[PDB]
Amino acid sequence: KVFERCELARTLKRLGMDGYRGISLANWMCLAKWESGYNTRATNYNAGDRSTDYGIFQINSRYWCNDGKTPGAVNACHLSCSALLQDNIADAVACAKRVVRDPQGIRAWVAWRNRCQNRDVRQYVQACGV
């Protein structure tokens, strides 16, 4: 599923993401936007280390979900990577929350550092009623 902007903002808000571990909804939107273009079926293979990025937040198989084919990987979210490819983002949200419970927080994603950190992210939630 490819969410429309405001549709996703309200979906994330309903799922308890607004201010989760101090991260505003606008930051999560900026993350999903740059990671996948709000596309829940997005996948990206990393030939360098044999891991794959899954879903709307492009969560990696080396540490967060199990796909059975990533060498020496772990599954911190205790989910099959398949769960991160659903139209319903509840599981992906639960895993993204798990990610930010770690020391780095929202900085876990390099894309957030490149396109969202120290930027005006208000534009991502404007007119969405969130």
Side-chain angles (χ1 to χ4, degrees), residues 49-123:
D49 84 325
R50 303 192 149 126
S51 69
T52 301
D53 300 318
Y54 296 88
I56 199 165
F57 297 122
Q58 288 291 272
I59 289 173
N60 191 264
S61 62
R62 180 152 299 289
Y63 322 94
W64 312 105
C65 61
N66 180 48
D67 64 359
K69 57 166 168 42
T70 308
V74 293
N75 180 11
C77 296
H78 294 100
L79 286 172
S80 154
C81 297
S82 176
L84 301 184
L85 295 175
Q86 301 177 74
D87 271 12
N88 180 297
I89 65 174
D91 291 324
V93 158
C95 187
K97 291 177 183 188
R98 168 60 183 92
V99 178
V100 309
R101 279 180 216 133
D102 271 6
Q104 292 188 278
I106 194 73
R107 282 155 168 82
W109 292 271
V110 177
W112 181 86
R113 280 137 72 178
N114 304 340
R115 347 284 295 208
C116 310
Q117 186 183 181
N118 303 157
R119 306 245 190 182
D120 186 332
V121 293
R122 302 161 185 90
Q123 58 178 315

Side-chain angles (χ1 to χ4, degrees), residues 4 6-7 18 20 32 35 44 55 58 60 62 82 96 103 113:
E4 289 183 64
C6 294
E7 178 194 9
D18 196 359
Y20 187 80
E35 287 299 349
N44 186 95
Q58 288 291 272
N60 191 264
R62 180 152 299 289
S82 176
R113 280 137 72 178

Side-chain angles (χ1 to χ4, degrees), residues 9-22:
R10 289 186 295 266
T11 299
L12 294 177
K13 197 188 198 315
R14 236 127 49 193
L15 291 168
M17 289 291 254
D18 196 359
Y20 187 80
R21 289 285 287 178

